[PDB]
Structure formats: structure tokens, C-alpha cells
Design a binder for these strands. Sequence first.
RNA 1: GAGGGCGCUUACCACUUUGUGAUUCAUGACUGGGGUGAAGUCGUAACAAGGUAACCGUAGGGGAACCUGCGGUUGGAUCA
Length: 105
Amino acid sequence: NLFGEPDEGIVISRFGMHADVESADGDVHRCNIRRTIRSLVTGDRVVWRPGKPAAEGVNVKGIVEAVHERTSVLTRPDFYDGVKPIAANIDQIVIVSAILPELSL
RNA sequence: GAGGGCGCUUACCACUUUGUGAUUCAUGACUGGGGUGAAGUCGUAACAAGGUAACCGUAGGGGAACCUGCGGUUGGAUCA
Ligand SMILES: [Mg+2]
Ligand SMILES: [Mg+2]
Ligand SMILES: [Mg+2]
């Protein structure tokens, strides 16, 4: 409760119980998520509010309220896990491989 | 004179000092695991004969669930 300013920002990472949300200027600010969120991935623009600092200048978390529409999505299914999206909202993929341990085709 | 007092000295001994142990609390870089986490990643181990029957003890292996070797049990199916 007692949330802050609704704004657009880019999610840095995903940690299940919470997520790292970068603001519109480059501020690392971790936030938890809304219970109605079906999925949240790395690099997804969201609607979020950075809570309210209890101590003056020292805040713990904010919340991520809403999720914008997807440009792309990387959904890969799995046995006994179902279809799970990994990443989204991307234009280019770079397949990176090495000769060690193996280089398969 | 007898005797007493003072003073001195000795015995006992508190506090106090050094050397060096035992024990206890607080602090403590670092470090060992474990628990609590529905949505995160990695795999599909076990529960059906769960797709190499499982489990226990022990040794070795490797991100990991685990696997292999030896021995035992049925808390195993199908089987005469
Ligand atoms: Mg299995
Ligand atoms: Mg099995
Ligand atoms: Mg056996």
C-alpha cells in the first residue's frame, strides 16, 4: 500500500518474489509485482509505482501494477512445466556458440 | 618493685602488583550449513513395471535432482 507515481520503466531482471525495475533515467529500484500478473520477463516495459519511503530517502521496494503489450515474445514449452515465456520485446537475437565443449549444428 | 600503657617487632590476613592458566559475556573481519519463499532459471528424480523396480548401508563420480560398484530387504509389478 501507499504507492507512488505511475510511470513507464524497463524491468531489469526477474526474481519471482520481486523484480528489478529501471526508471526513466537509470535508477536501479527493485519492486514486487501484482498478484493478477500472469507473467513478467526481462526487459518488459511496465506501469509501476515506487512505493513510499518510510525513512526520508530510504525506501525498500515499490510495486509493478500493469504490463504493457508485447512486441515479440520468446515462448518455449517444457515437459511438466507448460509453455513459459523467457524474454520479450526484442528486435534481434544473437546466437552465441563456442568450439568448446562441442559445436553442434 | 609488681603491673599497665605507648613504641617496636612477629604470626594471621583484606585490598593491591607481576608471571601464567581455567571459565563466562559482549564485540568480531571472515566462514559453515539449515529454514522460510505461488509464480525465476535449470533439468525430470521419485509416486504405475513412473518409462534402467525402489529403498537402506558404504565407497567413487559430477552444476544439481542423482548415477555406478558391493551387500541386504520387500516397505516391488509381472510372474508358476
Ligand atoms: Mg524420473
Ligand atoms: Mg524410477
Ligand atoms: Mg539390491
